[PDB]
Structure 1
């Protein structure tokens, strides 16, 4: 992992101006910009093909500030409104400079993606869910239209989803229709790619400038020269057990990341040179129950208490559950509401969890669940008193979802229903320069995507990873191509 001295490299197996490690969203975006800038670009990919986790993703791209898609669907937004939301939802300690920059450039970036051939359907999906069930292009994806954020920023949907039929998250998701047009764009520009390239270490000259990389390819060690810059775009550390334990131990035993090639190698390679890190504890957290069920009941913790409005982003529900409720949750829902939720339109019918317990009364359900006498009964009594007035003054679930819980009543066992992926990584500038602990860029070294700390510092919103990976991938390619 220690840097290799350039003087010890006897021959270069490959050479380029800009060397991109990793052919996912950050890598392809970097390659497009570097090639447009006139640089000779070589992408090094560890597997046999392009796509990475990106090609398996739902396809959300977190964009706003007044995109043509938002306007076509009739949703106002501005860079200031977007920034206000993101600072509140994606912290604490979110990078204000980076978020401001991301927001100010968001409409341009949407247009840039469209220009590269990424298609979006100008239609909005408005029901609770993890993704649009159909080929709709816009959806709320961060809890913008739920408490607490709906009183902090004006709600605006920012989940932009490329148009694709038969989307299968985990196999060939909506993320594929982000990747494919970008790859086509890069290929037409003359971007070169080498596969089975497992990048291992950076090569530095005697000034400390990164001037290439060492990799294993087809069973042998190879050296690849980078005349202008190396872009690290190899993904996260989610599958590195040592790093999960040291940095993000809330994910021990509950991995959710898409691919095992996310082993943190590029983070470590850069740290070897003195590169800085940020928010290494930050984790996306999913909650594997269908949102159409969740929104029609109340979530209670292990003490039978409500703790989150049931109409917020289900990722936020995941974080609140894992982080603050010791991963213990139950959905309390009346039979009629369960039936309605189970019939509602969803992209994830396989997440329609069946109730574990069902009873004629809350008193019986409470005993059945092993909760102390009164713990659940009182929660439901207070909820129902206010819900009869369409009010949730405790958690501010929107009135449209608020009504008394009736009988018979059921409980879903949602203990241990979370899993997630890492959001922390290398510290980078808005120009995607990797920062040394000195606060200065490491010459020749750039990075984007989930090997970096991006817009998310703590909270997560769907689309922020493909969003910041593509946005800062562009910036890395521009910076790397400079002479």
Structure 2
């Protein structure tokens, strides 16, 4: 992992101006910009083909500030409103400079993606869910339309989703129709790609400039020269158990990144040169229960207490459950509401969890679940008293979802229903330069995507990973192509 001195490289197996490690969203975006700038670009991919986790993703891309898609669907937004939301939802300690930059450039970035051939349907999906069941292009994806954020920033949906039939998240998701037009663009520009390239070490000259990389390809060591810059774009550290334990131990035993190649190597390679890190504890957290069920009940913790409005983003429900309720949750839902939720339109019918307990009364359900007498009954009594008036003054679930819980009543056992991926990584500038602990860029070294600390510092919104990876991937390619 220690850097290799360039003087010890006897021959270069490959050479380019800009060498991009990783052919996912950040890597392809960097390749396009670098090639447009006139650089000779070579992408190094560890597997046998392009796409990475991006091709398996739902395809949300977190964009706003008044995109053509938001306008076509009748939703106002601005860069200031988007920034207000993201600072509140994606912290604490969110990078104000980076978020401001991302928001100010968002509409241009949407148009840039469309120019590369990424298609979006001018239609909005408005029901709770993890993704649009159909090929709709816009959806709420960060809890913008739920408490507390709906009182902090004006709600606007920012989940932009490429148009695709037969989306299968985890196999070939909406994220595939982000990657494919970008790959076609890169290929037409003359971007080169080498496969089975497992990048291992950075090569530096006696000034400390990064001037190439060492990799294993087809079983043997190879050295790749980078005349202008190396862009690290190899993904997260979710599958590196030692790093999870040391940095993000809330994910011990509940890994949820899309691919195994997310082993943190590029973070380590850069740390070896003195690169700085940020938010290494930050984690996306999914909650594997269908949102159409969740929104029609109340979530309670292991003490029978409500703790999150049930109409926020499911990922935020995941974080609140794992982080603050010791990963213990139950959905309390009356039989009629469960039936309505189970019949509702969803992209994830496989997440329709069946109730574990069912009873004629809340008092019986409470004793069935092993809760102390009154713990659940009181929660339901107080909820119902205010719900009869359409009001949730405790957690501010929107009134359209608020009504008394009736009988018979059921409980879904949602203990240990979370998993996630890492959000921390290398510290980078808005130009995607990797920062040394001195606060200065490391010459020749750029990075984007989930090997970096991006727009999310703590909280997460769906789309921010493909959003920041593509946005800052572009910046890394622009910067790396400079002479």
CA positional deviation for 1:453: 0.1
Q: SS at the partner of 1:17?
A: strand
Q: Secondary structure at the match of 1:445?
A: strand
| Alpha-carbon offset, residue 119 of structure 1 | 0.1
Shift of residue 11 of structure 1? Answer: 0.2
Task: Classify the secondary structure of the residue corresponding to 2:18.
Answer: strand
Secondary structure of residue in 2 paired with 1:385: helix
CA offset at residue 447 of structure 1? Answer: 0.1
Query: Offset of 1:446 from its aligned partner?
Result: 0.1
Secondary structure at the counterpart of residue 331 of structure 2: strand
Q: Per-residue deviation at 1:435?
A: 0.1
Q: Could you tell me how far 1:363 is from its partner in structure 2?
A: 0.2
Match of 1:68 in 2: 68
User: Alpha-carbon deviations, 1:355-403, whole Å to 9, x = none?
Assistant: 0000000000000000000000000000000000000000000000000
Q: CA deviation at 1:297?
A: 0.2
CA distance, structure 2, for counterparts of residue 257 and residue 197 of structure 1: 21
Structure 2, unmatched stretches of 5+, are none
* Matching of residue 371 in structure 1 with residue 371 in structure 2: yes
* TM-score, normalising length: structure 1: 1.00
Residue in structure 2 matched with residue 245 of structure 1 by the alignment: 245
Deviation sequence 1:118-150 (CA, Å, 0-9, x none): 000000000000000000000000000000000
- Structure 1 vs Structure 2 CA RMSD: 0.2
Matched residue, 1:44: 44
Q: CA deviation at 1:320?
A: 0.1
Query: Shift of residue 197 of structure 1?
Result: 0.2
Distance 2:363 2:61 in 1: 45
Aligned to 1:100: 100
Using the TM superposition, give the Cα deviation of residue 457 of structure 1 relative to its aligned residue in structure 2, in angstroms. Answer: 0.1
For the residues of structure 2 that align with 1:37 and 1:396, how far apart are their CA atoms?
Answer: 50
The separation in 1 between residues aligned to 2:339 and 2:36, in whole angstroms, is: 54
Query: What is the match of residue 327 of structure 1?
Result: 327
Aligned residue in 1 for 2:311: 311
CA distance in 2, matches of 1:258, 1:75: 32
**Partner in structure 2 of residue 265 of structure 1:** 265
CA distance in 2: counterparts of 1:272 and 1:462, whole angstroms = 32
Q: Which runs of structure 2 are paired with 1:338-417 in the superposition (5 Å)?
A: 338-417=338-417
Question: What is the rounded CA distance, in whole Å, between the counterparts of 2:357 and 2:245 in structure 1?
Answer: 35
Q: Helix, strand or coil for the counterpart of 2:26?
A: helix
- Find the aligned partners of 1:14 and 1:450 in 2 and give their Cα distance: 26
CA positional deviation for 1:282: 0.1
Consecutive unaligned residues of structure 1, counting only runs of 5 or more, are: none
Offset of residue 25 of structure 1: 0.1
**Cα distance, 1:61 vs structure 2:** 0.1
Counterpart CA distance in 2 for 1:149 and 1:219 is 51
- Scaled by the length of structure 2, the TM-score of the pair is 1.00
2:332 counterpart SS class: strand
C-alpha deviation, 1:304, in angstroms: 0.1
State the Cα distance separating 1:410 from its structure 2 match: 0.2
- Counterpart in the other structure of 2:422: 422
Report the Cα distance in structure 2 between the residues aligned to 1:131 and 1:238, rounded to whole angstroms: 23
4+ aligned runs moved over 2 Å, structure 1: none
2-structure distance, mates of 1:305, 1:216:
53
Deviations 1:448-471 (A, max 9, x none): 000000000000000000000000
Aligned pair count?
Answer: 483
- Partner of 1:82, secondary structure, is helix
Distance in 2 separating the partners of 1:438 and 1:122: 46
SS at match of 2:434: strand
Structure-2 separation of matches of 1:235 and 1:143: 25
SS of the aligned residue for 2:437 comes to coil
Shift of 1:270: 0.1
Measure how far apart 1:63 and its partner are: 0.1
Please report how far the alpha carbon of residue 66 of structure 1 lies from its aligned counterpart in structure 2 after TM superposition. 0.1
Aligned equivalents of 2:166, 2:221: Cα separation in 1: 41
State the secondary structure of the residue aligned to 1:257: coil
Q: Distance in 2 between matches of 1:409 and 1:215?
A: 59
Residue 321 of structure 1 and its aligned partner are, at CA, apart by 0.1
Deviations 1:22-44 (A, max 9, x none): 00000000000000000000000
**Within 1, Cα distance between the matches of 2:254 and 2:34?**
37
Q: Please report how far the alpha carbon of residue 49 of structure 1 lies from its aligned counterpart in structure 2 after TM superposition.
A: 0.2
Q: Note the alpha carbon deviations across 1:99-130, whole angstroms, 9 max, x for none.
A: 00000000000000000000000000000000
SS at match of 2:316: helix
What's the secondary structure of 1:373's corresponding residue? coil
Instruction: Please give the per-residue CA displacement for 1:416-449, whole angstroms capped at 9, x wherever unaligned.
Output: 0000000000000000000000000000000000
Return the offset for 1:408. Answer: 0.1
Secondary structure of the residue that 1:289 maps to in structure 2?
coil
The alpha-carbon deviation at position 18 of structure 1 amounts to 0.1
Offset at residue 185 of structure 1 (A): 0.1
**Equivalents in 2 of 1:476, 1:442: separation in Å?**
13
Q: Once the 2 structures are TM-superposed, how far is the Cα of residue 182 of structure 1 from its aligned partner?
A: 0.1
Deviation at 1:164?
0.1
Give, in whole Å, the separation in 2 of the partners of 1:236 and 1:375.
Answer: 41
SS, match of residue 18 in structure 1 = strand
Task: Specify the SS of the correspondent of 1:267.
Answer: helix
**1:62 positional shift:** 0.1
Residues in 1 aligned to 2:19 and 2:135: alpha-carbon distance in whole angstroms? 35
